Design a protein around this ligand. Sequence first.
Ligand SMILES: OC[C@H]1O[C@@H](O[C@H]2[C@H](O)[C@@H](O)[C@@H](O)O[C@@H]2CO)[C@H](O)[C@@H](O)[C@H]1O
Lengths: 138, 136
Amino acid sequence: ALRFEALYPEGMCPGWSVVVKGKTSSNTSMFEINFLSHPGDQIAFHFNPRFASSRIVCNSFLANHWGKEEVNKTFPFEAKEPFQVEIYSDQDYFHIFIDENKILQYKHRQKQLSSITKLQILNDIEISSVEITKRGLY
Amino acid sequence: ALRFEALYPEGMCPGWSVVVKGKTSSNTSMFEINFLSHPGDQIAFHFNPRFASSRIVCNSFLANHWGKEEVNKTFPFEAKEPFQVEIYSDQDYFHIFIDENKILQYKHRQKQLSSITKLQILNDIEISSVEITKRG
Ligand SMILES: OC[C@H]1O[C@@H](O[C@H]2[C@H](O)[C@@H](O)[C@@H](O)O[C@@H]2CO)[C@H](O)[C@@H](O)[C@H]1O
């Protein structure tokens, strides 16, 4: 189910950081953080830790379908243990830091960054905080 | 216009903080932060700093009408300068702070606190941060 959604119509990319703190309930489920663009609620960036396999799957949902999965074996999550995920965007990538360590970068596929106005968090995450902050560029 | 909206379907009241950082663009416009209840996006709490008169108005839209306005004694905001406002809810009030100093408390009128699932920010505020945190 949808756990959290935010809308910032002026565009929350590039140059914004999103920090999500929480924990899972289960050791076999998953959660996801999505950045959506208008029109059409296309998913510019989907970040999906899958606890059953301890893999992070990232992708984009453009033209009504997923593209190529980018799968990461770095999995700094454990069931029921609090975590902090920070996602920051520049002109070129989304950058993911978990528990203050850099984990991965995901190259933009949706180039219309300013049309990314929505953040969505779904499935097995008990959220303690969401922060959305303008951090500038380099 | 709508500047920001957040939805937490499990209910973001009581026992949550919302911290908004930003600044106004004008010397004499206004902005508002509204907490909305489900179903219907109903205005459980409306917080409205009005820079033309330098007055804060708080109210609720309940039983089909706006209630009695609470006009705050003080107006600590300065236009065109960054501020940090926090709204924290307990069982009895919304508590509002600027620079971590309390400005006012507003007694809950909508008692269905758990149905308050949305935060909405409208009009003259250039947002630099929104933080929504469960205080537990
Ligand atoms: O690529 C990201 C998404 O994957 C979807 O699941 C895929 C699955 O990973 C793949 O192995 C195959 O079975 O097709 C599935 C459907 O496309 C998820 O459903 C979706 O939520 C994204 O995570």
